[PDB]
Amino acid sequence: LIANQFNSAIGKIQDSLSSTPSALGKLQDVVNQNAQALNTLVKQLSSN
Amino acid sequence: VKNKCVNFNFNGLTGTGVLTESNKKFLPFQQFGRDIADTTDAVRDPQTL
Numbered sequence: 001l002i003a004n005q006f007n008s009a010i011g012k013i014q015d016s017l018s019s020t021p022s023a024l025g026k027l028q029d030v031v032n033q034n035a036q037a038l039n040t041l042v043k044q045l046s047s048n
Numbered sequence: 049v050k051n052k053c054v055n056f057n058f059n060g061l062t063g064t065g066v067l068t069e070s071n072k073k074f075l076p077f078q079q080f081g082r083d084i085a086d087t088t089d090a091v092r093d094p095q096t097l
């Protein structure tokens with residue numbers, strides 16, 4: 001019984017991550033923030 | 049002279065780099081090309097268009 005519950009739970013983790021797109025936002029925003037900040041730096045070259 | 053690290057002076061535009069054959073589809077009324085940082089990156093030769 002415990003084996004069946006464990007295997008079903010693992011499969012539910014798998015398809016839950018595969019279906020929901022918005023899971024990993026805690027990672028993604030970090031990259032985005034650095035990307036955004038760096039991009040801002042480049043367009044500070046264009047002000048006189 | 050192209051594909052060599054040179055200094056160019058295009059109608060008073062001074063800079064340093066390599067000049068390369070482009071694929072930029074300049075419409076004929078245009079002359080220069082700027083980038084996000086407003087550096088010149090594309091230029092029309094005043095003798096050969």
